[PDB]
């Protein structure tokens, strides 16, 4: 709970510890089905505008059905669609739709087993067949075609609205929509579906605590419109790991303090992003889009994750440790820049650029020197560098400043590499040596000038 964000001036990198992460490592697919009606012929002869509205709504329903048939013609529409595609093809086999149709005639939820050997839950969110056949179909069948109440028209429109919005979303998204809207699956229906998943109690509790992240990580693949059944596979995530120790690493450029242009060598650790513990190994997330954050609890997706040995942890507290070889980049541009951490902010100033830190009531309170320096989030509320303005987040927690000599000092600018992307400390130790070896053999050359 207590976020202890530690800043290291040795590399001027901020590591925020004490996160309770919940990685996701699989999917559970529910065949969400809507019972349609195969109505195509209208026998009504009525000029009343209420009957005209009924016919217009029915035409909209028919066009939605035709659009869904076109989307099925688009079907099949890593790990993002496979499970949906697999159920899409299975439902295309003879009788597989029929067993789902005949298994839900008594309950709105059931676990049905298909020919693929997989048993899945089949929620029946909307039953349009019953409403169409029992309420407006008798009205259409009779030659009188007398709609009894306008509220019947309003209720028909309201019931059909979910199907129309589902069709619109599928058409604009070509059958695959994410995040799952509240039309594909209502939050109440999703919560009731989480309880019926075959998972632990911890997974159900975690999912019920954060339903919004579930929607952000979810999917809704259109599968099949056939036999008065519109089935789409909503494949929710599955969190195999819960409350694992997760920590973030933010890195900022570290360049030489020399005012003269061209002598600034910039180093920036490239292992920035998220780290989590999982099965004794560290799951590394390089980009921050995958790992959402909510109240000290980080949620992460393992499709882009990289497995790493646990020793990478001592990389954070010791960049020169022989257990792991951390990742850095070497560049020449020394543009002043600010990165907003969880409990403060790192600001790197070089050249003639000015950097200030201000509180909203006390005005400007701090002026930044050359190099990368870190400021806490209490008593300082805004940081302006040059002409651009950044915040400091109001997160509460202990923040530690660690006095560390800049690692760029031990790296000589003449032999320091340029424009590198994904180097490493052991990667950047011999190309310099080779450089000195380049010097050494060149040290032979003028020796060849001297000693011949």
């Amino acid at each position: 709970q207590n976020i202890t964000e530690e800043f290291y001036q040795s590399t001027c990198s901020a590591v925020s510890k004490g996160y309770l992460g919940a990685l996701r490592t699989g999917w559970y697919t529910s065949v969400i089905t809507i019972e349609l009606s195969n109505i195509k012929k209208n026998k009504c002869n009525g000029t009343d505008a209420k009957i005209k509205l009924i016919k217009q709504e029915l035409d909209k329903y028919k066009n939605a059905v035709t659009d869904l048939q076109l989307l099925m013609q688009s079907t099949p529409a890593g790990s993002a669609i496979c499970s949906g595609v697999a159920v899409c093809k299975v439902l295309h086999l003879e009788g597989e739709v029929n067993k789902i149709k005949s298994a839900l005639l008594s309950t709105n939820k059931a676990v049905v087993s298909l020919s693929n050997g997989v048993s899945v839950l089949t929620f029946k969110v909307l039953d349009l067949k019953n409403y169409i056949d029992k309420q407006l179909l008798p009205i259409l069948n009779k030659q009188s075609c007398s709609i009894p109440n306008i509220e019947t028209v309003i209720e028909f429109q309201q019931k059909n609205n979910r199907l129309l919005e589902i069709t619109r979303e599928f058409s604009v998204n070509a059958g695959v929509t994410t995040p799952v809207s509240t039309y594909m699956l209502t939050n109440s229906e999703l919560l009731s579906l989480i309880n019926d998943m075959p998972i632990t109690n911890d997974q159900k509790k975690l999912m019920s605590n954060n339903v919004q992240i579930v929607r952000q990580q979810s999917y809704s693949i259109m599968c099949i419109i056939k036999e008065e059944v519109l089935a789409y596979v909503v494949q929710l995530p599955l969190y195999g790991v819960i409350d694992t120790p997760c920590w973030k690493l933010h890195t900022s450029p570290l360049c030489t303090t020399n005012t003269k242009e061209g002598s600034n060598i910039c180093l920036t650790r490239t292992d920035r992003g998220w780290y989590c513990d999982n099965a004794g190994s560290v799951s590394f997330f390089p980009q921050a889009e995958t790992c959402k954050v909510q109240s000290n609890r980080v949620f992460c997706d393992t499709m882009n994750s990289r497995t790493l040995p646990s020793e990478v942890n001592l990389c954070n507290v010791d960049i020169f440790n022989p257990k792991y070889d951390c990742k850095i980049m070497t560049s020449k541009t020394d543009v002043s820049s600010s990165v907003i951490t969880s409990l403060g902010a790192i600001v790197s100033c070089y050249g003639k650029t000015k950097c200030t830190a201000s509180n909203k009531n006390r005005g400007i309170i701090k002026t930044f020197s050359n190099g990368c320096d870190y400021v806490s989030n209490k008593g300082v509320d805004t940081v302006s560098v040059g002409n651009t303005l950044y915040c400091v987040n109001k997160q509460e927690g202990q923040s530690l400043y660690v006095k560390g000599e800049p690692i760029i000092n031990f790296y000589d600018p003449l032999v320091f590499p340029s424009d590198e992307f994904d180097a490493s400390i052991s990667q950047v130790n011999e190309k310099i040596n080779q450089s000195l070896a380049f010097i050494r053999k060149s040290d032979e050359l003028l020796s060849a000038i001297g000693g011949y």
Partner: protein, 121 residues
């Protein structure tokens, strides 16, 4: 210290709704889940649902159609209500606590003082 106090009638005629309220003290409801365990006379304990820290609930599949667990953080209170109560459901009701997602703290340590529920007319 922490404490749980249970209020509400226990005796109820069959085929009616029975209500009960467990008010907590010494901890925040926004951090501790609270189950609701049941013990028939001369028979071990059984589980009757739970309400998580976020307000969500996971009922038992047997009583899912009648059970109802609610909560409120402001007064730090939890409410249980059962519908269509019949003779078999006479027992003792406990508003037991829970821990965190990591299981590493007191699964069902602190129980309520216990409220008898004799279902008869």
């Amino acid at each position: 210290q922490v404490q749980l106090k249970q209020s509400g009638p226990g005796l109820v005629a069959p085929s009616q709704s029975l209500s009960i309220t467990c008010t907590v003290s010494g901890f925040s409801l926004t951090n501790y889940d609270i189950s609701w365990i049941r013990q028939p006379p001369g028979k071990g304990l059984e589980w009757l649902g739970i309400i998580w820290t976020g307000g969500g609930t996971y009922y038992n599949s047997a009583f899912m159609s009648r059970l109802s667990i609610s909560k409120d953080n402001s007064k730090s209170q939890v409410f249980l209500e059962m519908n269509s109560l019949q003779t078999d459901d006479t027992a003792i009701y406990y508003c037991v606590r829970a821990g965190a997602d990591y299981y590493g703290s007191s699964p069902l340590a602190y129980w309520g003082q216990g409220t008898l529920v004799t279902v008869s007319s």
